[PDB]
Amino acid sequence: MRDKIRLVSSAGTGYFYTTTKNKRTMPEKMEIKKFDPKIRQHVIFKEAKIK
Amino acid sequence: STKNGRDSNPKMLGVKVYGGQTVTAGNIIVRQRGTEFHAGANVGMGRDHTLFATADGVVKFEVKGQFGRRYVKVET
RNA sequence: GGCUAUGUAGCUCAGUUGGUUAGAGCACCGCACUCAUAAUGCGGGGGUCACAAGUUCAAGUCUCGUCAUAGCCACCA
RNA sequence: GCUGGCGACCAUAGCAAGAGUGAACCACCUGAUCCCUUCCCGAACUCAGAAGUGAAACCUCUUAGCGCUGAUGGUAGUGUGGGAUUACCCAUGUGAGAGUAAGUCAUCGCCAGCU
RNA sequence: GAUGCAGUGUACCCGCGGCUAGACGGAAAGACCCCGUGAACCUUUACUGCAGCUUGACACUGAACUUUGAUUGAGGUUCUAACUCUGUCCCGUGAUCCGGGACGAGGACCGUGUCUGGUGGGUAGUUUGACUGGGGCGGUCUCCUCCUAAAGAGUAACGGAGGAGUACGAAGGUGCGCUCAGCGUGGUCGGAAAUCACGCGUAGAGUAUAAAGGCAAAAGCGCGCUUAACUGCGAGACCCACAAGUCGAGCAGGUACGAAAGUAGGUCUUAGUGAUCCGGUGGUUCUGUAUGGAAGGGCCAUCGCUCAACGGAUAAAAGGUACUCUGGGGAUAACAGGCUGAUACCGCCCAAGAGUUCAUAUCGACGGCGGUGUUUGGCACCUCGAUGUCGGCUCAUCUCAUCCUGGGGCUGAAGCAGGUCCCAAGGGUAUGGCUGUUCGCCAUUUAAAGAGGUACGCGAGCUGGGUUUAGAACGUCGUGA
RNA sequence: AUAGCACUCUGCAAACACGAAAGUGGACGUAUAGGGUGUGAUGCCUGCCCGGUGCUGGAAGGUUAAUUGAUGGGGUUAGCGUAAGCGAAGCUCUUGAUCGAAGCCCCAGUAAACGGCGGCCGUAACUAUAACGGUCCUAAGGUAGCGAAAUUCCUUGUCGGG
RNA sequence: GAACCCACUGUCGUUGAAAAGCCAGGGGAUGACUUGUGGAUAGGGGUGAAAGGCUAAUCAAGCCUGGUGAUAGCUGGUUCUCCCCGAAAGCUAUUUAGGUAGCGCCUCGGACGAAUACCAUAGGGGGUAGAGCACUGUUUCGGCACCGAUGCAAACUCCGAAUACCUAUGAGUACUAUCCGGGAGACAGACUGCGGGUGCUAACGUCCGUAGUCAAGAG
RNA sequence: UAUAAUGGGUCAGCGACUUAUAUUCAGUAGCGAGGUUAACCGUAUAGGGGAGCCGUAGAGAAAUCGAGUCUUAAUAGGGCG
RNA sequence: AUGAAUACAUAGUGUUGCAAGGCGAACGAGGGGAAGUGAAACAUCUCAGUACCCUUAGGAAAAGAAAUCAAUUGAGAUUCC
């Protein structure tokens, strides 16, 4: 089953998105460009535990 | 015992505004599962194939094209 | 959720922290012994040592995780 | 009067069969240098051009051969009131589908080029 | 299921002795059955407490030697002075209580207080869903698609059919590009069917998945680059008890793909879901119990329920009652009545055939049409502030679809007998063995031992053997009641 | 209920029962006694099973309570710093290394403890049956005796007597 | 086998002579016997040769007084007069189904008037009745899977009404629509005609849609 | 429901929507951008007693602002006024 | 005054004098302490420190003179509205 994960801004603002992923087919950590509203720029977001 | 006995809730689809009526921009004209009607001039199409008005005017239904499609449009 | 202990041939128990340089007993098949038989003796086949990585001159044997199982304990949205 | 481009309309307009056109346009056509292209191929896409052809294709004409269109009349159904209960009848209003006669080888707008 | 209604028949007014067919007679707010978020008592591996029993730590609790484990722990042996004696003696004292004194036997044990783990139907409070052609058993409970659904929407049944509790960082965005399936011909292995080439009529292919509505600017299929599967919103509508749900042009910021006009706020769409409370995590220019902080709280983002009885009563719950009880219902079952007639019984139509020939003396296949209101049933209209019985006994009354007796037609009717049909209800129409039996089997009679209705006639006329209270036992089921 | 039988507990300040305790019954008794449980004169007798639940005896491995409190992480401020920020000691919030019993898991015994005591397919010279044999699963697959029984649905089983 | 103590059978009695008896029979009758007097055990307790028996005609938890006017979504009852209007038995949710809540339906006050309805014209979408075989299924007979004749369909459609529904304009008629507040009741329905599911084209059967009547309406 | 569904043998007397407090709406009276006192004192229904309550401002969770305020980077848009 | 085990003593015993016990309304103080019910079920909770039981005063009782509040550095024992 797909597991829930957080995508955390690399700008250090603490902003984050949430999504799901299949760990069997995507073992590596997700990295994707997303818009951060605290700094109003597009930056890289990285996978973290849903916690 | 029976293996039947299920049904889904109604969806209330159908024509909401008929030909000759006056509409305001944003008014929904047709609720439809598929494209039984297609969008003409001043009519927009939603993600669930809803047809809505994008201008103020009078609704008109017609049949046009090489495929015989049913069109709805808004005349200003 | 926490602490533990296990998973080795067709069927079973070892081999357990370095140079493991996986064997032991029953299943078989063939051979020998017998006037004919066994038991017994010999040979062959039958696993690839739960999986995935890490260090290392040595990894079934250790460290990390992911399974299946067992034992005790804990669970006031 | 022909040719090309863009539309209106979407079979009375289409499909099929036969015939015709190279002055211009179009099409086939020559080559693979440079631009660009093939999950391989200059077949397509693209570029550079005029030795040929109207064959193919596209257009134009003819044909009711398939298709399409289609009355009038009648029948089925049906709202209202009345009468009956295998679900019909009467008054009044309405009126198909199928089939029959019959029709059809479209009709228009803008721009440019030839004779 | 009528003394009281309709039609009609009969009937002068009033006692007395008898009788029990009716007044759904009197008696007891039905005890059977169902319901109420009723009661009680009993059971248990239902839930949650407690008594009792038990473990260790600390306290009452001290002194000396010793041995041993990973500074500390544990063990052993002595001692007396705390403490024990329901052991002896002395005194208060005329006393098998008690108190004090002297011994003796024990002794830092036993035992008690506080805390703590285990056990705990011994005891206590409770729970143990609803729908339902009665209830139980079975099935079902939320969401999506089609039909029922009567050409707008909506529309029920334990009505007819299927799916869901997901998947995907590409299977999303964009620019560019491409058409499926099948068939017929040829062509190494290679054929029914692999791949190649050319043609014919063709959406019959596909669309992650069920169905429906759709799909050429294809919404189907590829390639390159990419993250719009953005943030703040949002005119206006659909749907709607609420809580919710759905579509959305357009504006601002940042971005991706395009030469560009532009397209993009996840996927052709409609299922893939869970309120509130209580907490966890990341931020935050809010709050901060004298003041500065902090703890805690608020706001924004997000996490934890098969709460599937899916608007979710608790964090936490199964059974028995024939030992039973209360409030209710003819809203709802068992008896009898009523409606109906599938079933049951009786009759008729056609007639293959059977009958040495010959459908119809007597039978009669395959099919068809009715009658009755005896059976098994369907429904739930009357009765639950009571219509109170399976059979026997006593006493009956009616129907005729006639068992005997009476009168006839036909006959495969010689006679005697028999078969079949028609008319006929005046009278008549067994005793015993077995069993609670009605029934049935049997023995022996008779002219015959008919079929039915009457609350399956008759218990305010009798009985009480069976069923169906409380006792007890066997087989079986259950841990147990 | 009973005489008879058996199991089991109890060494005396007995077990057991009543009670909050003091105390009382047991008993002014002492294992030939007292309590609990089942069976029920007598005759002949009383088979197999310890897998389950319980009881009894082991074992010292795993797990676990209070208690104890090693470490780690924060709050506050003397001070240091232009400032940002850093920041001892002392108080204080939190975390829980080590020690830690019974119980449970583990190993045996125990049925006159609660309890349990199977299935499938074939075989002897006509026909039948099976002294006999193969196979699967259990802790074990019903001995003696009895049997349409206070137990038997089919069932008024079949045969014999009356 | 008498007294005494019991209580196996039968008739009677059952508003009794009697809230358990009489009569005729019956069992024990030196024992685990019967009996007088006075004592002990007290309610989740006692006692029981054990029936849930007995504990003052009361027992699966005695009696009395208090908590107490327990609670009861249940049943019953609810008292003088006249005038006006006038329902519902549906939807949604519910440990909910004979209760209740929001909405629908009634009444009263205020605001506001033509914004409303009937009918006539005009515009509009449909997939039912019927019909048909062009798709999906199904059917019969011929010819060589196709071809020709021929039927059928709630979950088939190349077609396709009448009605109904939405909107605009208009004449006449009518105290019509709408908004804001106070008070409710009701959420067991019944029959009949028409369109249907279910049942047997049964039921005064059952479940929907639609209209009338009853309910709550006499003649 | 004439019902063969319930209740009443008859008469006379008794027998069931109350009281206190709070709150909302309507009518009526006083005063009116204001209205009103409570306990209490008081030869006491008077007269004193202004603490308090309602109305006169909203937005936001709040700090804060205020005819505006919240959300937001936004003076855009939008919600409550 | 007398008087043991036991030598002093003590326990024990006796006489005289003084005092107490019991009853009764409500209010007070203290020691124990439910359930029916509500939550539309029920265990936390409620009912409620209520009912009830027990001990014991006074004309009243209890409390009372800050190791108390407050947060412009202010108030000033207890009790009642």
Residues with CB under 7 A from strand G: B 15, 17-22, 61-62, 70
A27 touches strand H (CB under 7 A): no
Give ∠ CA A8-A13-A19 in degrees, rounded to 5. 25
Q: Are B51 and B16 in contact, with CB atoms under 8 Å apart? A: no
Measured in angstroms, what separates residue A41's CA from nucleotide E225's C1'? 21
Three-class secondary structure of residue B5 per DSSP: coil
Q: Å between A35 CA and G203 C1'?
A: 74
Choose among B31, B29, B36: nearest CA to B11. B31
B41: part of which helix (H) or strand (E)? none
Contact B56, B24 (CB under 8 A): yes
Token pair recorded at residue B38:
């297609």
CA pair distance B62, B47, nearest whole angstrom: 23
Resolution limit, Å = 2.2
A33 touches strand H (CB under 7 A): no
- Within 13 Å and on the Cβ side, how many CA atoms surround A23? 7
CB proximity list for B54: less than 8 A, separation 6 or greater: B25, B26, B42, B43, B44, B74
Helices H / strands E in chain B, number of each? 0, 8
Q: Would strands B69-75 and B38-39 be described as parallel, antiparallel, or unpaired? A: parallel
The residue written with tokens 């049949």 in the block is: B63
Cβ atoms of residues B30 and B38 within 8 Å: no
Compute the distance between CA of residue A51 and CA of residue A4 in angstroms, rounded to an integer: 9
Distance of CA A34 to the CA centre of its chain: 9
